[PDB]
Each structure stands twice: as structure tokens, then as C-alpha cells.
Amino acid sequence: PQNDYIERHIKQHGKRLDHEERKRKREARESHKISERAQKLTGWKGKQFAKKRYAEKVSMRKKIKAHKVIKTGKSRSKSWKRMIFTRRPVKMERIIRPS
Amino acid sequence: SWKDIPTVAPANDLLDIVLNRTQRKTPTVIRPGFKITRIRAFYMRKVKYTGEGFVEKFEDILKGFPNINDVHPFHRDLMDTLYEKNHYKISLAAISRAKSLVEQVARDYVRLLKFGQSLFQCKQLKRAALGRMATIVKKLRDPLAYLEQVRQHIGRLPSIDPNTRTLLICGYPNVGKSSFLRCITKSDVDVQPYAFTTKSLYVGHFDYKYLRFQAIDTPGILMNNIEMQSIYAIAHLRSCVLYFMDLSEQCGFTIEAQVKLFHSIKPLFANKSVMVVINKTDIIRPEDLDEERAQLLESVKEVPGVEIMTSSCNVMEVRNKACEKLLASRIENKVAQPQARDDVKRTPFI
Amino acid sequence: SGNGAQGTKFRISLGLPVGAIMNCADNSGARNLYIIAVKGSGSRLNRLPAASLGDMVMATVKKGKPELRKKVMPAIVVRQAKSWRRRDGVFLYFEDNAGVIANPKGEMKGSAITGPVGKECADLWPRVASNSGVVV
Amino acid sequence: RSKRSKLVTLAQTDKKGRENKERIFDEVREALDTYRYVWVLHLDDVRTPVLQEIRTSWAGSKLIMGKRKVLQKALGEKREEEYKENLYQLSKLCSGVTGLLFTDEDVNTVKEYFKSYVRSDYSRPLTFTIPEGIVYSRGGQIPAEEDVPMIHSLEPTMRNKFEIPTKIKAGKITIDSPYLVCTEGEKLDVRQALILKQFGIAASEFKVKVSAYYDNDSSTVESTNIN
Amino acid sequence: ATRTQFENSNEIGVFSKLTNTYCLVAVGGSENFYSAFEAELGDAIPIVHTTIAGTRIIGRMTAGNRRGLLVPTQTTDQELQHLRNSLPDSVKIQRVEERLSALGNVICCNDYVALVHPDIDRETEELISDVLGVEVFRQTISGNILVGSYCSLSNQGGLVHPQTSVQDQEELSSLLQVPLVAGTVNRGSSVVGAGMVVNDYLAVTGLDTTAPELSVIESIFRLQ
């Protein structure tokens, strides 16, 4: 805590003795990982990955420019009412307009 | 402190997470041959689940984030100077409006979807509801982006009680206040010579006469937000003010400037147990302070409530005197006997 | 085990299931307790949560001072009234099942406890033993 | 599909292409006749400010540099294809990174100036040892009371590349024992040269050298070689 | 004044009993609690790994002074034999058949004066007086029936729970003929008797005890 300790601790003691090299190795491996993920990641995840990759290519291309029948009552045979403001009496109205 | 806030994701990430959670949890397979009631219930359940998932995330933000409105004169001023209180309130109101819109959409579409009569109609209604929610979330991009940063910053702020017994180290920068703070209390703070070593109000705890104490070092004052933060802390905190002054020539600004600044901030200090400490005594021998310039300290002495302390970094003497000065004000603002039952004395068995 | 327990809990017969009424044993003013749930019990199908001597339960006061009614607070059973296996080799049971009310920290609401207090409850709860004038 | 990807970036500068080389060839050909004396210098390693100071340290003259093969083409690499009388011999002596100073004041004056021109240079020398404690910006070559401790940001550079076993507790860079960096009178390795350059120890000195000269009226190569 | 802890319980008095000539500690857990007393007491006085009725609350089930020790009926013959073997002949051990087995809570006593629960029969009161050789009185601390749990006493002084009234404090100080102070232990805990154990030259309390509490304990007990 106390206002950016992490940055102060890094300044006082630095990163791991094998942090930068591992980061560079991971950056190099990023291309292989991306290539593998395109063939892998089946199912719906593949669709999202492909869409994101295509969007990324779109960003590079953009930046290249650097410079009813109703039955009522206790019977199913009374198919009288219908369905599509002082609603009319239900016994009188034949067409019902839902609220 | 407000570390309890877990996180706030951006609009795109939040929408993606919510949609993935809704798709994975709720059922996904339905056929046109199923009864219309089954399809209607399925789509209504999907819409309700998506709405609830969107709402719950916003609730953690509104509830998790402490409302900057009049939390405390000390905390409120610091939060305003660090996050533009107007902007903070505007963002919170925008998030509340987005949550209300999402709730309205979820309530309306569920009411509308129950009238569906075909699979295509219900699917279209569900897609429209999901698109409404997605657009509402997307419009909340900048508020969420700003809230992520303010959450990351607030979660690491120092925690102090304004009414606790404390002393604030004040004065011009490059005097040595950082070294005094590091020595008086256990706190890791840079002691570099440039005049802006302290970026924030660093704090450190120490004990005196069994009473919990903690010293706070000002970032420096010479308005800039960094300078204004210390002023608001001084004006609102009940802590004693310890104005550190550098007598040596290791500061670009002259001695007269420090005294003039102390006089300028005198109205804020005067009612808060002011004490003046002279630093860098190890390489000046203030005896060199000839009468031609001794008037500078005499002007400071014009106020009976202050005195000059010669310290080199007397390190514990300054702390003891500051604690005594604080107690003098705080106390004002604030065993049985045996009879011995007899003439015969009984002694303990050791 | 909940907060305040200073050791493992012995396996003893289940005396008080959910809804069981147990008499009070402290001067807090309450006279009976209605058990609604048992802390630390692993709920399983068809199986009503049940407590035992030394267990901590959530209960609402049914009789006594009205100020304590309608509120649910943790309670510790001091008497079980159902035979349980003691490691000393005796099948002992208490005259009446009773419990005491305490906060999650284990502090006893009442300054003192009345009547016998089970060994398996006093030993596990230091505060109960300190506030209990009788053990076993 | 498996091919190396390019780390190219949208920089504000582009390659000059073959047009610049062809233009420089014609410029060299014209200068060969415009001026009287010609020289074939060696400037394998020189700081740009040194070259700029040279270009203005004497009166009206043209200092011409360029690709070695382009300069050979301008002069001609064969006797039959030589542009001027016996100009093939002059090209035959061009070995390293060569440059031509076209001027007509005096043959002796130019060589005397080359002999007397000396300036500080890096190691690309006397032995040096790092202090046994905190390493300063100059690596102990100046009093610690005047120098400043090294910036912690470059410690990874010291560890990964310079091979020095640096450690950071109280992150002002410190080492457990004095480290020998360079021996007496030896061609320093690339790592040692980089270490010396970082410390700013420019003990070495550079003096311009010329292999041969030429004159428009002599019709032959002035085989004078001085350093 | 020394800070220690049980396995994880800050109520030292519950799991231990300390006197001017002997100390008792629970056997459960590990020897970390046992070694804490050794650092201050060493081998000057015996320290016995003893249980009472199979419980670890021996500090509250038993009461006694340098002249005697009392145990309830639930104590097995093995525990009594171990206590007899592990203590000198100068320390009496007497089985008590009283109705209230909580001797540590019912009885609060020092080397000269003792307080007991009024419900205790006169026979057990006389037995306590004879074995411990101390004056025994029936008293409560401002209505706190369990004197042994809400009060701590020693030849140097005593400490009672904060709720004790001024009149009650004066009466108890006059009766016990030692200074008394009303205060909390273990960071505001009102059960002073069970929270800590104290003798004429050593006070042991839980880690939660705050610095003001430690200072008050030291001042009242005159440990420094």
C-alpha cells in the first residue's frame, strides 16, 4: 500500500533476475502461440478468436495510412373471442387488445 | 482505505463476459416443434438472466465505490483533488442511469415477449433485448475506463482517522522532512535531494506513552493539486502541524521565503498547535545566524504559540515535544486503597 | 467449527434438530430458544440440521423479555438431554436440554450461566467455562 | 506459410535507394576534375561531430564519403576502365571505409594536418578496476564525492550483457568485490568495449590516416602513407 | 508482564493456573505454551502438565494458593496422583465434593484472603479456609456471582471487571486488604479472571492485551 509501493519496490530491488529474458522469449513465442490458437480453439471460441484477429488486421490496414383464436369459459369448444381506453365489457367485447 | 472494491471492467470486456456467462449457464437448445409456451419460457428466462447479470455487475460498482459526497472534509477534499469530484459524481450518475435503462429494458421486453406466437418472433425479441443491453453497456465505455483507474488509485491510498492524535510534517521541500519521517516511524520513503521526492502524503505509525501515533509528511508547498492536497489536510485535520524549515544553503529558495510562506499559512496553522523545527543543524551551526538576519526568527516568534527547535537528521526530543504540545490541547478539549484492615503488615511471597 | 472453538469437536448423538425448543441457561432474560439452523452442519437431502452439546446454533427467543424476540443470534447448547458417548466410557444424559446465547466471537451475553454445563461444551468454549459455575 | 515476420514500423524516414549512390558516383567523378589534389582516407570509426568539424576546419574544399564499392566504381577498379590517368592504382589502395578530401592548397599541408589531427576516441589501454563498493556513473575513475551513483535502470544491462555480477540491495548499484574490466595494452572485447563506453572512459585517441594521394597534373598516385 | 497465548485462545486463565510456588498448564496442543512459562519461571517452581476431568480448562476447574490446591469430584484418581507426585509436600492437594465443581470460577483467592460463591456450603468454605489457610468471605463483585472469573487477586494487588461500581471497589479493597483496579484485559474483555493469570512476581495474559492494559496490570500488581 501507500502510494505506488510496487513501483518503489521495483526501483529498490528490480525485477526477477530472469524476468526480462523470459518476457522476450514469451514475446517471440507469441507468434507461434497465435498460429496454434487459430487451428486450435474449436467451437464458439474459434469464431470469437477469428473475429478478433480480423478486427486486428483491420486496425493495421487503417493505420497503414501513417502519413389469435381464444377460448373462454370452462370448455375448449367456445372459440368466440379473438386477440390482436375504457375497455368494453368482456362479455361484450369480441376482440381483445392486450395492454 | 477502500481496497474492498474488486475491479471494474471496461464496457467491451464487461459485455463480453456477461454475454459469455449468459450463454454458458442458461440452456441453449430449442426446437420449433416444441410448444410455444416452452420457447416463450426459454427466451424469457434467457432475457431475465442477461438482465440480472448486467444489473448485478453495476451494483458492485455503485455500492463498492464510496460516494464522494461529504464522506469527510479531509477525505472529501483529497478525493476531489485526486479524481475531480464533479467528474466522479457525473460518472457515478451515468452508471446509475445505465443500470436503470438496463432494468427498464429487461422489464419491458419480458412483458412483451410473453405474447410471442412463433419461434422467429421470440428469437428476434430476445436478440433485440440483448442488443439494447449491449448498446447501453457500450455507451458506458469512458465512465468504466475512468472508474478502473480511480479504483486502482484509491485502493492504495493511505488510511488515517482525521480525529486521531497525529502530527503533520510541513514546510518547504528539500528541507529533510522525508528523512525525519523515515527516522521517526517505520516507513519506506525516498530521501532524494530534489524538491519533489514525496509525491503523496506518506504516513507512518509510532507509539508514545502507549498512545497510537502516526506521522504524515506533506508532498511540498510553495494552485497545483499536489500542493492543494496538503493544504486541505492541514485545514481539516486536528493533527499538530510541524513546520520544517531548512537553515542551510542547500535550498534554492532563500530563508526569507520559508518564513514568508509560514506566515502566509499562519491562519491555518495558528489554531492547530503550531511548532517550528529547524533542520540541517549539523552543517550550519545556527550560531552563524547573525543578528542582521535573526529578525526572521523574531518575526516567527511574534506569535506566542510557536517556537524554534534545533534538530539534526534531538530526533526524539522533537517527537516528544510535538506529542506534549498535541496533548496540551487535546486534554483541554477532552485506584482503591486497602486501609490495611489492621496494624500487622503482610508481605508478598517471592 | 465456527469462531471461538479451540479444538476439534467430538462425534456425539444429535439431540436438537431444526425447530427444537431448548431452555435458556443465562441471566440474559430469555427463557426458551427456537432453533432455526445449525452452524457447521453439512446439509444433505431430506436431512434436518441437528445440533448437539457444544454446538453453535442460530435461534430466535420465543419466551422471555420481548426485546430479544424476533431477532436471530448465535446460541451454544449447554445441555443435550440425549445420551451421547463420552470417551471416559459412560452413557450420560442431562435432565433437560438447554442452551445459551452468545455472539459469533464466543462472548457470553449473560454474565453467568445457571445449572450444569456439559463438559464437551465448556471445554470447547473457554467463555462458557469461565461464565459457568458448574461443569458436569 | 511459416516465414519470418518483419518488425518494421511506420517510421518518418525511408531508404535512399540506388539513386543516392548513382548521384554520389557522378559527384565523385566531377570532383575528380574540379579539384587538383585527391586523397584516399580511412575513417572506419569516427563520431559524426568529428567529421563535421573536419569539414569546416579548413578553407573551401569538399570532403566526399560514400560506399566503398561506389567510390571504386567512380574511380574504376581496372586499368582499362580507369576514369583518369592511372586512377586504377588509386582505387586499388582503397581497402576500408574510405573518404576523399578534394582540395587544392598544398600536398604537404594536407598530410601535415592529417598527422597533427588527433582527438579523443573510445576503445571500440590502461587497466581499470571498478570500486569494491557502490559503482558510480564513471566507474570510480573520478572521486566519489564528485560523481553520482549509477541509475538503477541500467542494472539489467550490466547483468545480462556486461557479465558483471551486480546485485541491488539498497538499489544504488553495488558489487560484492572489485571487478577487472580491461587489461594492459590489449584489444578489448565487444563486451569490454561496451562497458568502457557506458562508463564514459574515452581514454583512446583517434588520428586521421591516409593511404595515398593523387594529383591532376602528376598523372600518378602519390603513394604517401601516414597516420 | 509477559504476553503469551494458548494454541489459539487468548484466555490464558482458562487453560492455565499460576501461583507463587507452582503453576498448572493444559497438556493439549504443543509445548509452545509450556515453554512460555519456562522463559520467565524457569525451574524455580514446578510446572506440571495436568488435566482435570479430561478437560483443558484446568485453570477454571481448580483453585488454590501456595499452601494448597483444590480439585473437583470429576477429577480422576490418576490426575490426583499425578498432581500429588509433581508438587512438593508444602502444597496441599484436597479433593472437594462440592456441588459446584467450577472451583476456579467459584473461588477467587490469594495467599491471605479468599472470596467464594455464597451458594457454597459452610463445610466446603471451612475446608477451603483450612487447606489454603486464608480468610474466606462470601462476596460478589457488583453482582458478578462468579468471583473467580471476573476478578484477579494477588498479594501485591488485584483487578476486577470494569463494571464494578466505586462502592463495590472500595468494599472489595477493604475486604481483601489489597489495592484494586477496575479495567479490561485482552483488548476490552470483561472476564479478567479467566483472561490472564497473575502472581506476586509474574503476570501472563493473552496477546490481545493492549499496552494500556499491560501498564495498568503492572502498576496495580507492582511487578515493576
Place this chain on the structure above:
RNA sequence: GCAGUCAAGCGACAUUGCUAUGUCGGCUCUUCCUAUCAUACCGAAGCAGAAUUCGGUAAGCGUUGGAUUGUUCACCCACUAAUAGGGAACGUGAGCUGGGUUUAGACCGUCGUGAGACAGGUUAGUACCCUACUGAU
């Protein structure tokens, strides 16, 4: 969604303002899927600790007791590591329950001259054959 916005290809990505007329439900039972709630193992996150978010494989196990709906609608209390979503004729009437739906009697509201009907609310209601499985000659 409406009405625009520029433009790699032949209009993708990005971009401008607002915005229930059905009966299914529950007790027991076995099995299966992962779109992983909990448990195992890991990566990224202002992970200083603690606590927490997301992401990758992984279905063995675990995924509850209760106020309360006949209910289709569906909300709360508490425990627990968590109390995740689904299928097997949205399994399970010669398994049970008929709970709700639906005969013959009867009560109240509307209409109908009338008999009657409901927009409606209430009441009471009739395996001993083959194979599979579990055991066993």
C-alpha cells in the same frame, strides 16, 4: 431497429442520436452432456498480504434444510467448499399422487322470452404371459 457517416473488396470492421389461454408439479429411482457453481492443477489482472475478477483442460465427487405458492408466472431465510445449467416421450398413470385440468348434483354475476351458455367465482365426486433387471439351481 430507424435515418446517416468513410471505404479494403465486390459492402466486412469500425462510426453519428434514443430505445402470456396454457394445463405441469412432486416423492422415490438409474443414467448421460459441459456451456465448470464448489473441489485438483495453471496464466493474466495495482496479486504488498488477506480477499477478489477473468481466462485454459478437466464431469470423479458435491450441488442442501426451510416461509410459499395446486400452480404454469416465481420471490425470500439459513447452513454448507458451493448450494451451476440441461437430456433420457421437457423419462418415470398396470409406480404412487389426479394435487390442476374434465362427466352426472348444487350455490353467486352477465346474457338469453325461454330451455342454457359462460368473461366467470365456489362446492363433491370408481401382471399368474414374454423379455430386461435383481437373486438362485
Place this chain on the structure above:
RNA sequence: AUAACGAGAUUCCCACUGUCCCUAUCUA
């Protein structure tokens, strides 16, 4: 044109109980 009374319809309190926690045993 509202008392008593009811194999009338529904709600609640004391006792109670294997409906249940969780089932087990016996007799023809």
C-alpha cells in the same frame, strides 16, 4: 321475499403423535 343447531366450506392455538429427521422390531 342473528342465539342454538351442522357427517356444510376455509383459517388458527394446547395436548398429541413414526408424516418426517430415520428408520428398526414383533404377533396371525
Place this chain on the structure above:
RNA sequence: UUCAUCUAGACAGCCGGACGGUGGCCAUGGAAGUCGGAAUCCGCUAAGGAGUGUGUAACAACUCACCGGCCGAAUGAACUA
């Protein structure tokens, strides 16, 4: 399939240069090629962008575009099925 550099030297790799006005004008407490706004030129080059990024509170340093040499024969970009 088409461009684009190629034995007067294509790419990988090695190392050296990557300059002065200028720490360009504003805001600054610091912001010097890099927290930012409008800009983005002059002098010399074989080349060097009022500097592509890393970066110490500024610097600095590292490093990208670009150029020089040694490495010695095709390489590099897009598109098509």
C-alpha cells in the same frame, strides 16, 4: 500472378555512425526526442525523423528508421488456388 532491391554487392547475422542551431514556441515545479497542444524547419552528410519505442522526477542511457563497412547469391512485399 504482379512489383521492388540485386556480384560497382538483394535479405539473415556482426559490429560502427545515428550529428549542431535547439534544453525548438506554449503551458512547468520538473516534461531536455518522448505526461501534453499546435507543429516538424534550418547547417552538414553516406546517412540521421524538432526523433519509432524502452526509460529515470528531469537528464542521461538504451534502442527503431536510415547510413558504413565485413558476411557472398537470390532475397523481400502483396495477391491467386
